[PDB]
Ligand binder design. Structure first.
Ligand SMILES: CC(=O)O[C@H]1C(=O)[C@@]2(C)[C@H]([C@H](OC(=O)c3ccccc3)[C@]3(O)C[C@H](OC(=O)[C@H](O)[C@@H](NC(=O)c4ccccc4)c4ccccc4)C(C)=C1C3(C)C)[C@]1(OC(C)=O)CO[C@@H]1C[C@@H]2O
Ligand SMILES: CC(=O)O[C@H]1C(=O)[C@@]2(C)[C@H]([C@H](OC(=O)c3ccccc3)[C@]3(O)C[C@H](OC(=O)[C@H](O)[C@@H](NC(=O)c4ccccc4)c4ccccc4)C(C)=C1C3(C)C)[C@]1(OC(C)=O)CO[C@@H]1C[C@@H]2O
Ligand SMILES: Nc1nc2c(ncn2[C@@H]2O[C@H](COP(=O)(O)OP(=O)(O)OP(=O)(O)O)[C@@H](O)[C@H]2O)c(=O)[nH]1
Ligand SMILES: Nc1nc2c(ncn2[C@@H]2O[C@H](COP(=O)(O)OP(=O)(O)OP(=O)(O)O)[C@@H](O)[C@H]2O)c(=O)[nH]1
Ligand SMILES: Nc1nc2c(ncn2[C@@H]2O[C@H](COP(=O)(O)OP(=O)(O)O)[C@@H](O)[C@H]2O)c(=O)[nH]1
Ligand SMILES: Nc1nc2c(ncn2[C@@H]2O[C@H](COP(=O)(O)OP(=O)(O)O)[C@@H](O)[C@H]2O)c(=O)[nH]1
Ligand SMILES: [Mg+2]
Ligand SMILES: [Mg+2]
Lengths: 427, 426, 426, 427
């Protein structure tokens, strides 16, 4: 029942920081690993349990922050893999010249972890699409990892190149090149828009000035509910492969949206009275989508609802019945139902120094929909435009990345878009 | 004689755990396995469900099967971790994850022998094996996969013994999986062919009962399983002590199956009333039959009054007049002659045991072979069809080596079942 | 009567040390050699294994043979350094180092007389010598070298006495030497010709048993040797006190060897259960035979069900019904008529002693003459062949004066053994 | 069960220093020999037990360091044999003109030790291939010692002329001349590459600046596990000749690689959780080979695994089964098995002022393989090249070393290479 986490570039690492902070909070584990859970922490005889994680950055910077900051004592030094020269927002360099120089070490460290791990369920990769050290390197690693562990589940939690705003101008390229690897090798991928989150921080948490710290904490909190939640023994312990059983209808379509519906400020925690139906209803409102997408313009393929803390199955069922009664949101016509429920007994995790106020229960939604496919069209336009001018193409050609690879990457993305169109239309 | 109780999957295990609570209490057995009951009849047939180990430690004649370590752990950590025998805890590789093929065809198949060895060990500790009882869900994957897997295997060993199962049926409005039709269809395909009697219980129906009659604010699974366990006991309670009219799994089958294949039953339980309403109860045989033949008190979702009764078993508990019972049976068949199948002269089989459930003055349990149940099969078949037409989720079973032919064959054979029930309904 | 127990090599010495712990405890003997038992029957046949020295100090009728000083030291430093007699500690020049030729042919040969003198001294202290028991490994070098060396010598002195040995057999997956086939092959070559009965025990099989049944987290050699010692006692326990049916090494041989040469036996032991599972035990003769005829509880690696039973000895311990035992024997042979060799009418020889192992209410031990054991010989022969084809490691024996002819002759003669077991299997 | 140690040139002595430091630490023996073991230390009635060792250096320098430094009181003055003029990196001078002037004394001192020693098992020689006082003198001594004690085991622990880097330019010559003596007279030889060790110090001990002090300590630690370990009475006391029984299949092939798999830094000692399988697995990774050789390009002939401290046989067997299951590393086809196990009860030895952090258990591997044979080809090229030009030949001719001897030495080395080729190929 154990798993391995992987972190790349800067984003994957920073997100990881939030995740492993949460896990420590959940299990009472100290910054030096001391406990005063074995699926995240390798058992240590001294009590200093150590994270099952691989950290990669071709420019140690963010890892040095970890090495010098808190939880440098938590993580094992062998896990903190760094390079010398960064990929620098170039998928091709991360994929090849630079990334390939450490990929051997990376795989060796993974192997050690996998040899230590008895009941390995799968992996959880944290990456972006912007940087090459995230995008390109992940592409390399996932291919290699897929070969070694064809029977293990590969989760990818990605930071989706936001449609409204971004920070690098060559993102479209790195994003589209990643797509044909993730779609090929991953078992389940998640796409998260920073801008959608910032918007959530503004509206729900009432934050005028939001940053990566709080943004990441929300993302990590979702992952806790997806994974760690199961490992606390609830009423309905839905397996990670059980998620796939019910969420995924085809060989493809590995793109669920992960939302969190108890997002709430400390002030609201006093006035607001939440419950099962209230929170469940909130997660189907085109506001907490965690991505620039409006479900109301597509259909629901599948929807897993994960509950934590003080919930009962009766109310959950009733809320779902109400949703199906509402009939505002559309479901795939050839999918009789699409609702699956996971239930914990353990409460929601609270971050000291956070904002997300303490609640008695929580809901996460993992939903497959045809609406999300529209987001790729926006990326297609961005790509097509820059591609038409071959802008920045020489940075990938300088690596040796075949021009035709870009056209192939697009076609694979377009295929994916087409599949979702067929799902919604056909009956 | 002795009966083997096998539990398969979390659902089946949770139900069984409650079941063994109930009957251990019934037979005066504490959480050490020691007997401290007040009657002598509690030990008269204790052998049916318990091995008598040295020191008079009574050990559930039961096998605990699961593919998801953790559920099995919760059993060991529960009050009956001191009751169940450790070598009856069979589990290994992680569970199917709602994948019937993993449960039956592949991963679960690998561990069959580890169960059957225990089956043999149990069999050889018996003086006379009567049959097997399987407790499981019909859509879970492991419980439904290992369920029919083991049923086939067990019948091959004991073709002349009674195969009984209590199966939790996919409920219209109570879900938790989108391949519930795939798993159910693949399961029932093998269930029918290898089963002598099966009971169909809907969580939705129980959800209704546990509020409509018991007025529970927060009906939990432990309460729904409790309702199930009550009926499970009733089915075999006649075998464990004296009564005016005896009964048996075989006796029931003989009087409950008129047509080999139609051995699907709806279960019910008498006095269903809230703790504030119990003071208004008459506790008479009339009252009990009003409840027993109340469609709303049926633990299958399908409402019997849309079909007909091929045959009914009414098993009563406690001191009562035999005439009084017979009168009520007559009144019922006279009342709803349109509901009962006219091809049968006496549509109701009765039995009366001398001992009510501890704490009740008089009780009963209801087993109905109605034609209405066909509608549950129809509903599931339709859901299955809708998905199957798009080969939805098929790759999860394709990857296990399951072809399309099995799925089309199963559905075809499911249609036959419904058709047969319709054949015998007007 | 009296029986001589000779230990050869570290393996044999460690097993024997545990053995003498067990039977000294059985006969109420403390670590001074003084008797403080509660029964009188403990002294009825104490002469079998102990000299009665002045002051009533009971001294193991045993000879401790080794070529590696240090192991012998650990024996003297252990709890039985006050038990074993100092002139029975025979050792000198350093050990063979897994070199059979050093153990048998050369270095060990030089010290034979120092053993045989002790043998004579032991013999002349006896009132009636029945036979010898040798405890050793079959691949160690010294234990296997000195083993067959001394066996030959002893038979020359006592050709009409019983040569019994407990030999630890090279296990498929449990090693510690790459010339295990050379040493085993050279050993067994002389073993067969000069032995009346031999027991084949695999460390691998014990490793499986000690976890599968005893659930030991850290099975050590002291635990594996403990399992062995239990069966060693059982073989001769019938000679040391009263019983409904007596038994003997001769009696066993008479009923266990149908064909002179086929005197290789698999050993087993009844109640095998973990300390948390003992509370679920029935402790009945049925239960015991279920374990005794369970392939998984056999201390030879080869699974009996790939062969047939030429003859079986079932020796039981403690108060029990003779009919009950006989019934179970019948049930077993009826159950697996395909496993038992049809050429024998009653395939099972039984014996029942009145005294269970202290602390047990009822026990037993199992000795099987199966044809399946041929497969262990095959496996070893194949390993031997593969190496021998390249004359691998041959120079280690060449330097001791061993030629190729011995090795080819041994293998040829090993093939005969297997062939004979196959001759008598369908 | 007793043995005699021999040290030549500077390297043999410096390595010896580490070895005898370890033995003192193990037995609690003080710098003046006082104990507050008899197989290394001759029993002294005063309690001042003295090392069974012979030290040779044709230029007393390094011995003077011993004579003036710590453990000058430990060693007997009779054992500290020195010359006046050094061999100076000339095998021929060490073999003849210079070495022969003290070899009589050396043999006499050995004889005294052997006369004192009851159950002599054999000898342990520490030498190099670089210097003539190590290489040439050892050649002389081994021949003489072989004559006197044909029945005693002769171990040779040699510092292999590293393929990447060295310190003398005439090493190839001294190395190739040694080969035909060692192969002839030794019973078991070990070859160690300083550069492979330095690499191990960098990777495992995390040392950026490694030197002979720490390097030697690692080598000595291995020898302790090979020898002294046996003399502490473990579960499986595998004799030195028992090693030979199982490790050596032929009259030749006396070249096992000796690795140590608990190499670990003080920091890692806290985070790392080691056990039997973990450590055992590490020793088969082409990283801790202690020599510039990659096992994955050859086959395993034999492999003895020596365990110390907190181990059990069950786990050892399981680890081996896993290795055979792995099947990545290849074994000789006509060698059914190749695994042998030794087990101690006494823990690993800890050096105060060292780096190798204290662990609860340890594993040494003594492995024969065909992969190592490739290392001699590299030496052959170095030799052939310099030989072709007869570079420096006049330094050996000036001694009188027959030119043909060099050609003969090569042929003997080449024969050895050929034998290993046949082992791997034939079946
Ligand atoms: C003071 C008093 O008389 O209390 C009654 C009581 O109030 C009522 C409401 C009981 C009560 O049952 C429930 O509330 C209930 C809870 C969950 C699921 C189902 C039912 C009772 O809990 C249940 C209990 O039942 C028994 O004792 C039977 O022997 C029953 N036992 C169990 O189910 C059982 C419960 C816990 C632990 C072990 C066993 C049984 C029935 C059939 C076959 C075997 C055993 C009874 C009479 C009562 C209480 C205690 C309040 C009723 O149920 C039963 C099964 O008898 C509910 O309607 C009936 C009418 C009873 O009068
Ligand atoms: C409280 C109680 O009843 O404890 C039992 C016990 O728990 C069990 C588990 C014992 C226990 O045996 C083991 O755990 C065991 C350990 C290593 C190797 C093999 C076995 C027991 O240790 C062993 C011990 O056996 C004896 O006393 C016999 O006389 C036995 N003696 C020895 O092996 C022996 C051990 C230590 C020192 C001297 C002798 C014997 C068997 C055959 C022939 C001669 C003697 C018994 C009954 C028990 C304990 C003490 C827990 C069992 O074994 C035996 C040989 O009886 C293991 O399965 C059986 C079932 C027993 O019930
Ligand atoms: N959600 C989230 N996104 C981040 C965070 N940090 C960076 N990003 C996004 O990730 C993009 C770049 O991803 P990375 O792979 O981490 O960039 P990098 O680590 O510098 O790697 P290179 O750019 O290739 O050198 C940025 O444009 C941001 O939009 C973070 O902490 N949280
Ligand atoms: N492993 C190890 N190698 C050493 C050490 N000291 C020297 N060496 C190696 O040994 C080689 C020379 O060996 P020696 O025989 O000791 O040289 P020497 O002692 O001066 O003898 P001559 O050179 O002949 O005078 C050097 O090139 C080094 O590579 C040491 O302390 N440890
Ligand atoms: N009656 C009842 N049904 C349950 C319970 N828990 C789960 N179920 C049903 O059983 C199904 C899951 O079966 P499960 O035992 O988990 O099979 P598995 O997941 O393959 O091991 C769910 O769809 C539920 O409808 C319970 O406590 N009682
Ligand atoms: N059953 C058992 N076998 C052992 C034990 N110790 C060693 N062996 C086996 O015996 C062999 C070694 O025999 P040994 O007595 O050392 O012979 P020697 O080395 O020539 O003295 C090994 O290969 C082991 O398989 C033990 O304690 N119990
Ligand atoms: Mg970067
Ligand atoms: Mg020098």
């Amino acid at each position: 029942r154990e798993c391995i986490s992987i972190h790349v570039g800067q984003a994957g690492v920073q997100i990881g920081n939030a995740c492993w902070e949460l896990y420590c909070l959940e299990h009472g584990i100290q910054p030096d690993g001391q406990m005063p859970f074995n699926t995240f922490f390798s058992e240590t005889g001294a009590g200093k349990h150590v994270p099952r994680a691989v950290f990669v950055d071709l420019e140690p910077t963010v890892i040095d922050e970890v090495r010098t900051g808190t939880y440098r004592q938590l993580f094992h030094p062998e896990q903190l893999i760094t390079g010398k020269e960064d990929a620098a927002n170039n998928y091709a360099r991360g994929h090849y010249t630079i990334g390939k120089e450490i990929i051997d070490l990376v795989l060796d460290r993974i192997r050690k972890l996998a040899d230590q791990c008895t009941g390995l369920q799968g992996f959880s990769v944290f990456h972006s699409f912007g940087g090459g050290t995230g995008s390109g390197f992940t592409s390399l690693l996932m291919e290699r990892l897929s070969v070694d562990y064809g029977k293990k589940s590969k989760l990818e939690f990605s930071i989706y190149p936001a449609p409204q705003v971004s920070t690098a101008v060559v993102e479209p390229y790195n994003s589209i090149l990643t797509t044909h690897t993730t779609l090929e090798h991953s078992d389940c991928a998640f796409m998260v828009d920073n801008e959608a989150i910032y918007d959530i921080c503004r509206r729900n948490l009432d934050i005028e000035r939001p940053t990566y710290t709080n943004l990441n904490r929300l993302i990590g909190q979702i992952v806790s509910s997806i994974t760690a939640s199961l490992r606390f023994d609830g009423a309905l312990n839905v397996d990670l492969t059980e998620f796939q059983t019910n969420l995924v209808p085809y060989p493809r379509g590995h793109f669920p949206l992960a939302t969190y519906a108890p997002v709430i400020s400390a002030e609201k925690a006093y006035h607001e009275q939440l419950s099962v139906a209230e929170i469940t209803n909130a997660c189907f409102e085109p506001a907490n989508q965690m991505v620039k997408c409006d479900p109301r313009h597509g259909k629901y393929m599948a929807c897993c609802l994960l509950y934590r803390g003080d919930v009962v199955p009766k109310d959950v069922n009733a809320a779902i019945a109400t949703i199906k009664t509402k009939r505002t949101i559309q479901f795939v016509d050839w999918c009789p139902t699409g609702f699956k429920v996971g239930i914990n007994y353990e409460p929601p995790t609270v971050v000291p120094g956070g904002d997300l106020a303490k609640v008695q229960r929580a809901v996460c939604m993992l939903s497959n929909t045809t609406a999300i496919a529209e987001a790729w069209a926006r990326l297609d336009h961005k790509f097509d435009l820059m591609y038409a001018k071959r802008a920045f193409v020489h940075w990938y050609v300088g690596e040796g990345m075949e021009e035709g690879e870009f056209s192939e990457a697009r076609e694979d993305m377009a295929a994916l878009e087409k599949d979702y169109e067929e799902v919604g239309v056909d009956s | 004689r002795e009966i083997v109780h096998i539990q398969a999957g979390q659902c089946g295990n949770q139900i069984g755990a409650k079941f063994w609570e109930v009957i251990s209490d019934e037979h005066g057995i504490d959480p050490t396995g020691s007997y401290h009951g007040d009657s002598d009849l509690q030990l008269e047939r204790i052998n049916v469900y318990y091995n008598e180990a040295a020191g008079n430690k009574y050990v559930p004649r039961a096998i605990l099967v699961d593919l998801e370590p953790g559920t099995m752990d919760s059993v060991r950590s529960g009050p009956f971790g001191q009751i169940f025998r450790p070598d009856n805890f069979v589990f290994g590789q992680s569970g199917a994850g709602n994948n019937w093929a993993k449960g039956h065809y592949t991963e679960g198949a690998e561990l069959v022998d580890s169960v059957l060895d225990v089956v043999r060990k149990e069999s050889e500790s018996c003086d006379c094996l009567q049959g097997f009882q399987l407790t499981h869900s019909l859509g879970g994957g492991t419980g439904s996969g290992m369920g029919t897997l083991l049923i086939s295997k067990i019948r091959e060993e004991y073709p002349d013994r009674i195969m009984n199962t209590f199966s939790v049926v996919p409920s219209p409005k109570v879900s938790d999986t989108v391949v519930e039709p795939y798993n159910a269809t693949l399961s029932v395909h093998q269930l029918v062919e290898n089963t002598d009697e099966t009971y169909c219980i809907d969580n939705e129906a129980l959800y209704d009962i546990c509020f409509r009659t018991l007025k529970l604010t927060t009906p939990t699974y432990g309460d729904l399983n409790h309702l199930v366990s009550a009926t499970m006991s009733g089915v075999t309670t006649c075998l464990r002590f004296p009564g005016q009219l005896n009964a048996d799994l075989r006796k029931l089958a003989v009087n409950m199956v008129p047509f080999p294949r139609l051995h699907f039953f709806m279960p019910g339980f008498a006095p269903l009333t809230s703790r504030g309403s119990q003071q208004y109860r008459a506790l008479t045989v009339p009252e009990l039959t009003q409840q027993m033949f109340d469609a709303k008190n049926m633990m299958a979702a399908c409402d019997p009054r849309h079909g007909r009764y091929l045959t009914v078993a009414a098993v009563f508990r406690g001191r009562m007049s035999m005439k009084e019972v017979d009168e009520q049976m007559l009144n019922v068949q006279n009342k709803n002659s349109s509901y009962f199948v006219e091809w049968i002269p006496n549509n109701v089989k009765t039995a009366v045991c001398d001992i009510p459930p501890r704490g009740l003055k008089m009780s009963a349990t209801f087993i109905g072979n109605s034609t209405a149940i066909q509608e549950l099969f129809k509903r599931i078949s339709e859901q299955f069809t809708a998905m199957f037409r798009r080969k939805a989720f098929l790759h999860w079973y394709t990857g296990e080596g399951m072809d399309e032919m099995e799925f089309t064959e199963a559905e075809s054979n499911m249609n036959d079942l419904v058709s047969e029930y319709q054949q015998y309904q007007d």
